[PDB]
């Protein structure tokens, strides 16, 4: 749950 990981 990385709040700043890219959209999937």
């Amino acid at each position, epitope marked *: 749950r*990385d*709040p*700043y*990981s*890219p*959209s999937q």
Partner: antibody
Amino acid sequence: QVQLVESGGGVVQPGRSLRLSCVGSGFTFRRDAKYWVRQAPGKGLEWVAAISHDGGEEDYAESVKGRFTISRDNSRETVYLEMNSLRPEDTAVYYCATTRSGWYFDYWGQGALVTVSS
Amino acid sequence: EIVLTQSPATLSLSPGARATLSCRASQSVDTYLAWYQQRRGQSPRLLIYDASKRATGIPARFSGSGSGTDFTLTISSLEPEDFAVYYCQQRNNWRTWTFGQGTKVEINR
């Protein structure tokens, strides 16, 4: 290719506000987080603000928290930095940046100069 | 909090020489570390990420190594454009990104 173009720099008196814009092209703007990193004259790099891909998350350095607001409009491929209650030590070149994972600043803009002085 | 510090302040070398730059983290950052190059009057650009992976388009003379608290950026043979300032960078607790204070590579004489 990936390009980021900042606009909105200039001179502003202490206590006033200034809004920076950054428009992306050559990649899917909505996919990744966006950031602002600044560099005071003769100084090193200081991360300023971060915003998630859809704007649901925002975070700031303690030096600007409560005074700065980062936002984005993905339909216009633009990320903004709203700077209020500006101080002389906020004088810096402000770079906009985008990431491939959220961890690093993979691509950088050309920088916008903000000078805070009475 | 995690603090990055870099060494040396100034690295004085001849063109074509091998350059070794250091970055230290106050606590372990595993291999989550990036290196940036900033030439005079230019924006920073990403060189190395995840401690050892080269960014796209970056020449093979740049390499990174290290883990935990100690990291190195190596420039196998310096080119004229490589005389610049280099920054390392990390990210702790998902919501904070920080840099080292930078290392300047200058021309020795």
